[PDB]
Amino acid sequence: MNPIIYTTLIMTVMSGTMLVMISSHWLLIWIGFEMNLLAMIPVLMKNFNPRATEAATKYFLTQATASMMLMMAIIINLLYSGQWTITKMFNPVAMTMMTMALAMKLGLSPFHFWVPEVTQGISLQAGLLLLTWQKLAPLSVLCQISQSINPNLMLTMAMLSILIGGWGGLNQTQLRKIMAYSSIAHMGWMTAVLPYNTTMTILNLLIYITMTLAMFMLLIHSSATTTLSLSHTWNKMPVITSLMMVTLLSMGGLPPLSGFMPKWMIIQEMTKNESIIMPTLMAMTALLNLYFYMRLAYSSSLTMFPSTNNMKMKWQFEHTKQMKLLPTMIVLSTLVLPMTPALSSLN
Amino acid sequence: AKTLLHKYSDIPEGTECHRKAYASTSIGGATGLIVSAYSIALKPPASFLEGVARTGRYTFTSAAIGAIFGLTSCISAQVREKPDDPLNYFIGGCAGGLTLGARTRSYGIGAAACAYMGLTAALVKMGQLEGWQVFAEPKV
Amino acid sequence: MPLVYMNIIMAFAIALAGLLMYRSHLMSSLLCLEGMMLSLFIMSTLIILNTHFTLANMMPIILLVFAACEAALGLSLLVMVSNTYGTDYVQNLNLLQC
Amino acid sequence: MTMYIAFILSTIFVIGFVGFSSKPSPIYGGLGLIVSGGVGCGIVLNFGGSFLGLMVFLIYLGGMLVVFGYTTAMATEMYPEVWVSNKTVFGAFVSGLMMEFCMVYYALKEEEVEIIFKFNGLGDWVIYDTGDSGFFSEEAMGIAALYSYGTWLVIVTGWSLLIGVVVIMEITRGN
Amino acid sequence: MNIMLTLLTNVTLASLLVLIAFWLPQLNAYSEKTSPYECGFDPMGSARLPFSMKFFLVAITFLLFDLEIALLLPLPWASQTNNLKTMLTMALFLLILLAASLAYEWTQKGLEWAE
Amino acid sequence: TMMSGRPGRVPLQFLPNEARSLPPPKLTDPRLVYMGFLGYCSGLIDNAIRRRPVVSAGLHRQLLYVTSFVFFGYYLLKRQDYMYALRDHDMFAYVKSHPEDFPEKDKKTYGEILEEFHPVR
Amino acid sequence: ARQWQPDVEWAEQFGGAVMYPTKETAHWKPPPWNDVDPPKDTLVSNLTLNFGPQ
Amino acid sequence: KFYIREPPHGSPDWLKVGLTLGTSVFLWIYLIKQHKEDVLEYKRRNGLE
Ligand SMILES: CCCCCCCCCCCCCCCCCC(=O)OC[C@H](COP(=O)([O-])OCC(O)COP(=O)([O-])OC[C@@H](COC(=O)CCCCCCCCCCCCCCCCC)OC(=O)CCCCCCCCCCCCCCCCC)OC(=O)CCCCCCCCCCCCCCCCC
Ligand SMILES: CCCCCCCCCCCCCCCCCC(=O)OC[C@H](COP(=O)([O-])OCC(O)COP(=O)([O-])OC[C@@H](COC(=O)CCCCCCCCCCCCCCCCC)OC(=O)CCCCCCCCCCCCCCCCC)OC(=O)CCCCCCCCCCCCCCCCC
Ligand SMILES: CCCCCCCCCCCCCCCCCC(=O)OC[C@H](COP(=O)([O-])OCC(O)COP(=O)([O-])OC[C@@H](COC(=O)CCCCCCCCCCCCCCCCC)OC(=O)CCCCCCCCCCCCCCCCC)OC(=O)CCCCCCCCCCCCCCCCC
Ligand SMILES: CCCCCCCCCCCCCCCCC[C@@H](O)O[C@H](CO[C@H](O)CCCCCCCCCCCCCCC)COP(=O)(O)OCC[N+](C)(C)C
Ligand SMILES: CCCCCCCCCCCCCCCCC[C@@H](O)O[C@H](CO[C@H](O)CCCCCCCCCCCCCCC)COP(=O)(O)OCC[N+](C)(C)C
C-alpha cells in the first residue's frame, strides 16, 4: 500500500471515531460508525493473504449487521419520539436493539465469536488498532445513554464476556487469540460498571489501552506470533522478555501493579450499591485470565526454552526501527497505582 | 420469560407440592430448550432426527432435574414444618444433582452435582430470605 | 401505530433473519443487507413524511449513499473471496478455525 | 378499509422480502428485491414522497444491474435454485408467507400486541394532516436544504464517497 | 389512479399478445427443435458456468457514482435558496470530489479492463 | 454520569477560572516527585530497550523524560484538587439546602445507652 | 547440580494447534509460519464457444 | 572499531542535544513562572497577601 493512502485511511478511521464522539445527532453518529468501518476494512487487508481476506469479510459482515440494528433502533426511537438527539432513548424496544447492536460492535458475549478470528487473521499492527482504537466509539455511545441502559441485559452480557474470555483464553497457543480473549474479558469488566459509574468505565478503558499497547508493541519488537516463537526471545532480547513478564503480571491484576487499579475501583463502585455477588464472581473469574497470563510468562521469561543455531547470526544485528512510547507505555502499565486518586480528573 | 418464575414463586413455600413441581419442571424445560437451541446452532447434528433427539434429551434431562428439585424441596419444607430454611433447598438441589448423575450414568457427576446444586440452591434461598440482589439497581 | 408500519417492520425483521441464516452463496447475504437498507429507507421516509419534519427529508438520501458504500465494500470482498477460492461459498471461509 | 391500496402495496413489499430472504439464487433474489423496490416507491408515493420513491427505485435498479453482472460472474452454479426447486428454500418461503398472513390476521381481527405495541389498522388514511398550505412541495424544499443547511452532511458524504473509491481500489488490488 | 390504469392496460395488452402468439399457431415441438442453439453443433459446457467479468472494478465504481446522482438531482430546487454563495460552494465541492475520484481511478489504471 | 452535566461548565476547559482560587500544589509535592520518578524509570527503560548503558547513556533525553512527566503531573494534580474541591462544595451545599434529610440527632452518653454484653468464654 | 530447564519434549506441548488436544481437534494443523496459506490451484474453466459454421 | 561508522555519530548530535536541552530548560522555566503566578493569584483571591 502507498504510504499516503495508508495515512489517509488511518486518518479516516480516526475521523470517524471523532465524529462519533463529537456529534449530538443520531444520524451523524451512524455516519461516523459507517465511515470508520469503510476506512477500517482495507487496513486489515494491508498485507494480502487468504487469512486477511477472511478476517476482513467476517469483520465487515459483523459490523454491517450491527449498523443495521443501530439504524433500526434510531428509527424506532424517532417514531416513538420525534427526537434526533442522543439521549435517554425514550423507547425500551429501541433501547434493547441499540444495546445489542453496540455490544456486537464491541464483541461482548454472546457476540464475541468474531473477535478471536479477526485478530488472528490480521497482522500485529492491525490487531493493535482493532483491539485498542475500535473500542472507543461504541463505548462512548454506551456511556452517553447509560441512564436508560437496562442493568439486567448489560450485566448479563458483561458477566458472559468475562466468563467466556477467561475460558477461551485457556485453550490458546497463538498470541493473537490470547489477546483477543483477554480483550473480551476486559470489555466485560468495562461494561459491568457502566450502569453505575461511567468514570470507572473510562478509567478501565485507559488502563486497558495502555497495557494492550505495551503488549502489542513488545510482540512487534520481538517478532513473535506463537508461544514457541516467543520462547526464543530470551536468547536475543532478555530485557524485552522481562518487561513482557512484568506487563503480563500487570494484565493479570495482581497488586501493586497498574492493572489492579481498574478492578479495585469497579468493585468499590459496585459495592457502593448493593451488588455484592457479582464483583465476587468477576474476581474469581479474572483468576482464569491470570492463569493463562502466567502460562505465557512461564514459557517466555521465567524459564529458558531450547533455541536454534541460527540465532547466533541474529545476535549481530540491532532492531532497526524503534517504536516510540514503548518505554512510556510500559511505565504507565506497571508503576501507576500510587497515582490512583488522579481518576477524579475524569469526571 | 419470568412469568414462569412468578408462577413458581406465587405458590407458598410449603403448600401444593404438585403445582410447585409443575412450575419447577416448566422452568427446567425452558432452560433445557434454550441450551438445545444454542447447541444445535453452534454444533450441527448432521441430520434432522439426530438434532431433535439431542433437543429432546437435553430438555428431558433439564425438566426431570427441575421437577425432582421442586418436588423434593416442597415435600421437605412441609413434612419438617420448617419453611424459610435453606436446608429444604439444599435437599432439593442434591436430589436434582442425583437425577443429573443418573441421566448421565456416572457416580462422579452425580456426587459433584449433588454438592454444587445443593450449595447453589441453599445460597438462592439465603438470598431470598436476606434480600441479596444478583443485579442491583443503580442507587448511587 | 398504523398497519403499514407493521408491514415495514416485518420486512426489516425478515431481511435480518435472512441475513442471519446463511445458505451457501455470499451474494444472497449481501442481497439481504441491501433489503435491510431498503426497509430502513421506507420506514424513515414514512415517519418523516407523516409528521411534517422538513429538514429530515435529506437523511434518507444520506442513508442510501452509505448503503451504496456498504454494497461496494461487500462486492469488493466477494470479488477477492471468489478469486481465492473460485466460488463465493461461505464454507470456504474457515481458515481462522485453527 | 378504503380500496386497501396501501395495505396491498405493503403486503407485496413483505412478499418480495420473503422472496429474496429465502436465498433461492441471486438472479431471483435480485428480481424479488427489484419488485420490493418498486412497491416501496409506490408506498412512499402514496404519502407524498414522490422524489424519494422515484430516486430509491432508480438507485436500486442500478444496484441490481450490478448484482446481476456479479451473479453471472461469481455466484452461479450448474442448476440455479428457484423457490420450488429445493426443500429448504420452499420451506423458508412458505414459512415467511404464513407468518405474514398470521400477523395480518391477528392484527386485523384483534388489536393484540405483537412486538412493540398493538396497533389499530382502521386504514392509514386516518392519520393524515388536512394540510392546506404551500405553492411549493415540502419534501423538495427539505431535500434542497441539503446545500443551505446541510453543509456538514455534504462534507462527510463527499469524503466518504471519495474514500470508498480509494477503498475499493485497495481491496481489489490483489497481489 | 390513472397511472395504475395505464400500467394495467399496458401489461394486459402485452400479456394478450403473448397469449395470442402461443395459442394461435400450430405448435410441433420435438426434442431436436428445442435444443440449445450453437451455430451448428452441440455446446460443450453450460450457459450456467461462470462467465468472467473483466470490468468488475468499473461496475463497483458505478454504484458510488450512481449515488452521486442522488446528491445532485435536488440542485434545481437548491438554486432558489436565499444564500446562494454557500449553496454554490457546496455544489461545486460535491462535483470537484466526484471529478477527483474519477481522476484517481483513472491514474491508478482502474478504468482499464483486466487482461 | 454524576459530574458530567453541571451548570456553568465549559466543555473542554480542563481548568476552569474558578480553580485559581485554590492553593497550587507545591513543587516538592510527593506526587510530583513520584511523577519525576516515573519519568526517570521511562528514561532507564528507554536506555535498556535500545541496548545502551542504562544509567549513563542519554542524559539530555532522560532529563527531558523527567521534566515532561513533572510538567504533565503538575496540571494533573491541579485538576484533581479542583474536582475534589467541587465535590466537597456541592455536597456541603446540598446538605445545607436540605436540612430535613440530614437532621442532627440527640447526643447520648455511654452511661445511658444499653449495649448488650457478650462474654468471651 | 544445575537447575532444570525445559527440553524439546517439554517445549513441544506448547507447539500444537491448541492446548489440551482432543478427539475433535486432533487433526487441526498449526497455521503457516508466515500467515500465507498456499494458493489453491483452482482449475480455471474458460467458456468454450462454437463460432460457426452457421 | 566498527566496519561502518554507526550513523549515530561518534560525537553527540549537537542539533538534537541542543533542542532537547532547550525544551527541558523552557519547560522548567515555564513551570516555575506558572507556579509563581498561581501562588500570587491564589493569595490575591483569598485575601491572604
Ligand atoms: C425486529 C427484531 C427481530 C428480528 C428477528 C425476527 C425473525 C422472525 C422472522 C423470520 C421469517 C423467516 C423468513 C426467511 C428466513 C430465512 C431462512 C433461511 O434462509 O434458511 C437458511 C438455512 C440454511 O439451510 P441450507 O444451508 O440451505 O440447507 C442445509 C441444511 O439446512 C443444513 O444441513 P444438515 O441437514 O446437514 O444439518 C442437520 C440439520 C439439523 O436439523 C436440526 O437439528 C433441527 C431440529 C431442531 C428441533 C426443534 C425442537 C423440536 C421440539 C421443540 C418444541 C417447542 C416447545 C414444545 C414443548 C416442549 C417439547 C419437549 O439441519 C440443521 O442443522 C438446521 C438447524 C437450524 C434450525 C433452524 C434455526 C432457527 C433457530 C434455531 C432453532 C433451534 C431448535 C431448538 C429448539 C428451539 C426452541 C423451540 O435453512 C435452515 O436452517 C433450515 C430451516 C429453514 C426453514 C425455516 C426458517 C424460518 C425460521 C425463522 C425464525 C424462526 C421463528 C421466528 C418467529 C418469532 C416470532 C415472531
Ligand atoms: C476436610 C478434611 C478432609 C475431608 C476430605 C476427605 C473426605 C471427603 C472426600 C472423600 C469422600 C467424598 C467422595 C464423593 C463420592 C465419590 C464417588 C465418585 O467419585 O464417583 C466415581 C466412582 C467411580 O466411577 P464409576 O465408573 O462411575 O463407578 C464404577 C464403580 O467403581 C463400580 O462400583 P460398583 O458397581 O461395585 O457398586 C456401585 C454401587 C454399590 O455400592 C458399593 O459398591 C459399596 C457401597 C458404597 C456406598 C454405600 C454405603 C455403604 C456403607 C455405608 C455404611 C454407613 C457408613 C457410616 C455412616 C454412619 C455414621 C455413624 O454404589 C452405590 O450404589 C452407592 C450409592 C450411594 C449410597 C451411599 C449414601 C451415603 C451418604 C452419606 C451418609 C452419612 C454421612 C455422614 C454423616 C455423619 C454424621 C455424624 O464411583 C464410585 O465408585 C463410588 C460410588 C460409591 C459412593 C461412595 C460415597 C460414600 C461416602 C460418603 C460421601 C459423603 C462425603 C461428601 C458429602 C457430600 C456428598 C454427596
Ligand atoms: C517500591 C520502592 C521502589 C521500587 C520501584 C520498582 C523498582 C525500581 C524501578 C523499576 C524501573 C527502573 C529500571 C528499569 C529499567 C532497567 C532495566 C535493566 O535491565 O537494568 C540494567 C542495568 C544494568 O545494566 P548495565 O549497567 O547497563 O550493563 C549490564 C547489561 O545491561 C546487562 O544486560 P542483560 O541483557 O544481560 O540483562 C538480562 C536480564 C535483564 O533483565 C532485567 O534486568 C529485568 C528488568 C526489570 C523489569 C522492569 C519492568 C518495569 C518495572 C516494574 C517493577 C515492579 C515492582 C513491583 C514488585 C514486583 C516485581 C516484579 O534479563 C535476565 O537475565 C532474565 C532474568 C529474569 C528475571 C525475571 C524478573 C524480572 C522483573 C523484575 C522487576 C523488579 C524491579 C527491578 C528494578 C531494577 C531492575 C534493573 O541496571 C541498572 O544499572 C539500573 C538500576 C537503577 C539505577 C539507579 C541508580 C541511580 C543513582 C544511584 C544513587 C541514588 C540517588 C543518589 C542521591 C543520594 C545522595 C548522595
Ligand atoms: C476549527 C479547526 C478545524 C480543524 C478540523 C478540520 C476538518 C474539517 C474541515 C473544515 C471544518 C468544516 C466546518 C464547516 C461547518 C459548516 C457550517 C459553517 O461553516 O457555516 C456554513 C458556511 O458555509 C461554508 O461554505 C462552509 C464550507 C466551506 C469549506 C469547503 C469544504 C472543505 C472542507 C475540507 C474537508 C472536506 C473533505 C475533502 C477536501 C476537499 C454555513 O453558513 P450559512 O450559509 O451562512 O448559514 C446557514 C444557516 N442558515 C440557513 C440559517 C442561513
Ligand atoms: C496509566 C494511565 C493512562 C493515562 C492515559 C494517557 C495519559 C496522558 C493523558 C493526555 C493529556 C491530554 C488530554 C486532555 C488535555 C486537554 C483537553 C481537555 O479539554 O480535556 C478535558 C479534561 O481532560 C480530560 O478529560 C482528562 C484527562 C486526564 C487523564 C489522566 C487521568 C488518568 C486516570 C488515573 C490514573 C493515574 C495516572 C497518573 C499519570 C500517569 C475534557 O473535559 P470534558 O469535555 O468535560 O470531558 C468529556 C468526557 N467526560 C466528561 C466523560 C470525561
Coordinates of N, CA and C in Angstrom, one line a residue, chain G:
Chain G
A1 N 23.0 -31.2 39.5 CA 23.6 -30.0 40.0 C 23.0 -28.7 39.5
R2 N 23.0 -28.6 38.2 CA 22.4 -27.4 37.5 C 20.9 -27.4 37.6
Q3 N 20.3 -26.2 37.5 CA 18.9 -26.1 37.6 C 18.2 -26.7 36.3
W4 N 17.1 -27.3 36.5 CA 16.4 -27.9 35.4 C 15.7 -26.9 34.5
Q5 N 16.0 -27.0 33.2 CA 15.4 -26.1 32.2 C 14.7 -26.9 31.1
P6 N 13.6 -26.3 30.5 CA 12.8 -27.1 29.6 C 13.6 -27.7 28.4
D7 N 13.2 -28.9 28.0 CA 13.8 -29.5 26.8 C 12.8 -29.6 25.7
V8 N 13.2 -30.2 24.6 CA 12.4 -30.3 23.4 C 11.0 -31.0 23.7
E9 N 11.1 -32.0 24.5 CA 9.8 -32.7 24.9 C 8.9 -31.8 25.7
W10 N 9.5 -31.0 26.5 CA 8.7 -30.0 27.3 C 8.1 -29.0 26.4
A11 N 8.9 -28.4 25.5 CA 8.5 -27.3 24.6 C 7.5 -27.7 23.6
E12 N 7.5 -29.0 23.2 CA 6.6 -29.4 22.1 C 5.1 -29.5 22.6
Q13 N 4.9 -29.4 23.9 CA 3.5 -29.4 24.4 C 2.8 -28.0 24.2
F14 N 3.6 -27.0 24.0 CA 3.1 -25.7 23.6 C 3.3 -25.4 22.1
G15 N 3.5 -26.4 21.3 CA 3.7 -26.1 19.9 C 2.6 -26.7 19.0
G16 N 1.5 -27.2 19.6 CA 0.4 -27.7 18.9 C -0.6 -26.6 18.4
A17 N -1.7 -27.1 17.8 CA -2.7 -26.1 17.3 C -3.4 -25.5 18.5
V18 N -3.7 -26.2 19.5 CA -4.3 -25.7 20.8 C -3.7 -26.4 21.9
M19 N -3.9 -25.9 23.1 CA -3.6 -26.7 24.3 C -4.7 -27.7 24.5
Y20 N -4.5 -28.7 25.3 CA -5.4 -29.8 25.6 C -6.0 -30.4 24.3
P21 N -5.1 -31.1 23.5 CA -5.6 -31.8 22.3 C -6.7 -32.8 22.6
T22 N -7.8 -32.8 21.8 CA -8.9 -33.7 22.0 C -9.1 -34.5 20.7
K23 N -10.2 -35.3 20.7 CA -10.6 -36.2 19.6 C -11.0 -35.3 18.4
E24 N -11.8 -34.3 18.6 CA -12.3 -33.5 17.5 C -11.2 -32.6 16.9
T25 N -10.3 -32.0 17.7 CA -9.3 -31.1 17.2 C -8.0 -31.7 17.1
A26 N -7.9 -33.0 17.0 CA -6.6 -33.7 16.8 C -6.0 -33.5 15.4
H27 N -6.9 -33.3 14.4 CA -6.5 -33.2 13.0 C -6.3 -31.7 12.6
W28 N -6.4 -30.8 13.5 CA -6.1 -29.4 13.2 C -4.6 -29.3 13.1
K29 N -4.2 -28.3 12.2 CA -2.8 -28.1 12.0 C -2.5 -26.6 12.3
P30 N -1.3 -26.4 12.9 CA -0.9 -25.0 13.2 C -0.8 -24.2 11.9
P31 N -1.1 -22.9 12.0 CA -1.0 -22.0 10.8 C 0.4 -21.9 10.3
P32 N 0.5 -21.5 9.0 CA 1.9 -21.4 8.5 C 2.7 -20.3 9.2
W33 N 4.0 -20.5 9.1 CA 4.9 -19.6 9.9 C 4.7 -18.2 9.5
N34 N 4.8 -17.9 8.2 CA 4.2 -16.6 7.7 C 2.8 -16.9 7.3
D35 N 1.9 -16.0 7.7 CA 0.4 -16.3 7.6 C 0.0 -16.2 6.2
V36 N 0.6 -17.1 5.3 CA 0.3 -17.2 3.9 C 0.0 -18.6 3.6
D37 N -1.3 -19.0 3.4 CA -1.6 -20.3 3.0 C -1.3 -20.5 1.5
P38 N -0.9 -21.7 1.1 CA -0.5 -22.0 -0.3 C -1.7 -21.7 -1.2
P39 N -1.5 -21.2 -2.4 CA -2.6 -20.9 -3.3 C -3.2 -22.2 -3.8
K40 N -4.6 -22.3 -3.5 CA -5.3 -23.4 -4.1 C -5.3 -23.3 -5.6
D41 N -4.7 -24.3 -6.2 CA -4.5 -24.3 -7.7 C -5.9 -24.6 -8.3
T42 N -6.8 -23.6 -8.2 CA -8.1 -23.7 -8.7 C -8.1 -23.9 -10.2
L43 N -8.7 -25.0 -10.7 CA -8.8 -25.2 -12.1 C -9.7 -24.1 -12.8
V44 N -9.1 -23.3 -13.7 CA -9.8 -22.3 -14.4 C -10.6 -23.0 -15.5
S45 N -11.9 -22.6 -15.6 CA -12.8 -23.1 -16.7 C -13.2 -22.0 -17.6
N46 N -12.5 -21.9 -18.7 CA -12.9 -21.0 -19.7 C -14.2 -21.4 -20.4
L47 N -14.9 -20.4 -21.0 CA -16.1 -20.7 -21.8 C -15.6 -21.2 -23.2
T48 N -16.2 -22.4 -23.6 CA -15.9 -22.9 -24.9 C -17.1 -22.6 -25.8
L49 N -16.8 -22.0 -27.0 CA -17.8 -21.5 -27.9 C -17.6 -22.1 -29.3
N50 N -18.7 -22.5 -29.9 CA -18.8 -22.8 -31.3 C -19.0 -21.6 -32.1
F51 N -18.0 -21.1 -32.8 CA -18.1 -19.9 -33.6 C -18.2 -20.4 -35.0
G52 N -19.4 -20.5 -35.6 CA -19.7 -21.1 -36.9 C -20.0 -22.5 -36.7
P53 N -20.3 -23.2 -37.9 CA -20.3 -22.7 -39.2 C -21.5 -21.8 -39.6
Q54 N -22.7 -22.0 -39.0 CA -23.8 -21.1 -39.3 C -23.6 -19.9 -38.5

